[PDB]
Amino acid sequence: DILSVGILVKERWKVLRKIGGGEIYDALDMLTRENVALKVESAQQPKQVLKMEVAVLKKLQGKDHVCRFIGCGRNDRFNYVVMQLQGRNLADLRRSQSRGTFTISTTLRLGRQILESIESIHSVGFLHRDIKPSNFAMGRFPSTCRKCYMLDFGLARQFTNSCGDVRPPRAVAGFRGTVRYASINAHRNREMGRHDDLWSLFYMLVEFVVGQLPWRKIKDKEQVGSIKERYDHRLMLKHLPPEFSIFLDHISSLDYFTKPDYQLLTSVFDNSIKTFGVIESDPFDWE
Ligand SMILES: Nc1ncnc2c1ncn2[C@@H]1O[C@H](COP(=O)(O)OP(=O)(O)O)[C@@H](O)[C@H]1O
Ligand SMILES: [Mg+2]
Ligand code: NA
Ligand code: NA
Ligand code: NA
Ligand code: NA
Numbered sequence: 001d002i003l004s005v006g007i008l009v010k011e012r013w014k015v016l017r018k019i020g021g022g023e024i025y026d027a028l029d030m031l032t033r034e035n036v037a038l039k040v041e042s043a044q045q046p047k048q049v050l051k052m053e054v055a056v057l058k059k060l061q062g063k064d065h066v067c068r069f070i071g072c073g074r075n076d077r078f079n080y081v082v083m084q085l086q087g088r089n090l091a092d093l094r095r096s097q098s099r100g101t102f103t104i105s106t107t108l109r110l111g112r113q114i115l116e117s118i119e120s121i122h123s124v125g126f127l128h129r130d131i132k133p134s135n136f137a138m139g140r141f142p143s144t145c146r147k148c149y150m151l152d153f154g155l156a157r158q159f160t161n162s163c164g165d166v167r168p169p170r171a172v173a174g175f176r177g178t179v180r181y182a183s184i185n186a187h188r189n190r191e192m193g194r195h196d197d198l199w200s201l202f203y204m205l206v207e208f209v210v211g212q213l214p215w216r217k218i219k220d221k222e223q224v225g226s227i228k229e230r231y232d233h234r235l236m237l238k239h240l241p242p243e244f245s246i247f248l249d250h251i252s253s254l255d256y257f258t259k260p261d262y263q264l265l266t267s268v269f270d271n272s273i274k275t276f277g278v279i280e281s282d283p284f285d286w287e
Contacts, residue, residue: 001023002023002077003023005025010071012029013027016028016035022041025037037084039080039082040079041079041080042077043076048079053153056156057081065120087144088138090148097285100211101208101211102208110148110208111205112266112273115266117149120150125159126156128153129176129196130200131181132177132180132204135150135152157192169191173189182228183195193255193257210239241276246268247265247268
């Protein structure tokens with residue numbers, strides 16, 4: 001690691017506890033007397049991504065489901081960013097459930113919040129490219145703990161130009177994200193688009209309700225991609241509310257050059273939540 005518990009960054013943030021390992025700490029902000037999240041990277045790491053992370057976090061400021069930006073810096077030893085500290089991430093919350101699953105009520109509410117966050121990052125011109133449960137966390141206070149926050153913009157890519165139009169895709173793009181949640185496009189080393197973040201959301205929602213994905217045990221990235229390319233994704237509809245056939249049909253129709261119909265996808269969640277009688281104040285599974 002570059003830092004260690006106890007050290008002070010910028011005479012202000014005292015590192016207290018490592019919370020993620022990418023080196024991230026719970027730190028004391030001496031100016032506000034609050035615990036914050038501080039993420040650091042070596043100025044010698046070949047893949048340096050905190051520049052991207054700060055730029056996207058700044059672009060999302062003020063929007064829902066985004067940590068507040070607190071500060072950032074760059075020195076000869078490391079780069080760092082400081083942001084609002086959240087609570088438990090969704091991978092940990094699902095694993096803390098004795099059955100390894102969420103109910104459809106918790107799944108639909110989380111999915112709708114995650115969809116909102118994906119529409120927000122696309123609306124500022126960026127793809128997330130690593131949508132997965134450990135990159136989402138609930139708030140840690142009574143006023144935030146029912147809110148899900150999108151994390152980890154290090155692998156993001158701008159898909160618009162300086163003008164705001166969609167940029168021409170590269171012929172070949174390195175696969176950056178997580179094999180388990182990656183779309184077919186990612187596996188093919190094709191330029192990822194907005195629909196590929198939505199495919200990762202779909203896989204997350206299926207894994208929430210079922211507890212696993214079909215390729216859970218498969219570790220060869222090419223084997224996983226082969227399975228996904230041939231898989232009949234309609235089989236995943238079995239444990240989701242009926243309108244997710246509309247969700248799957250829609251994202252299947254998309255490609256790099258087609259903006260998603262976010263209103264349609266939102267309606268799938270809104271309608272399912274209403275049909276199941278789900279209300280926001282219902283306890284989440286971990287309550
Ligand atoms: N603002 C935050 N508040 C709380 N936990 C965070 C925060 N940012 C990241 N984490 C935790 O750290 C883990 C890894 O951080 P993340 O930003 O995803 O970086 P990386 O995946 O590159 O290690 C997350 O899965 C989450 O548990
Ligand atoms: Mg992460
Ligand atoms: Na930046
Ligand atoms: Na920048
Ligand atoms: Na790439
Ligand atoms: Na097209």
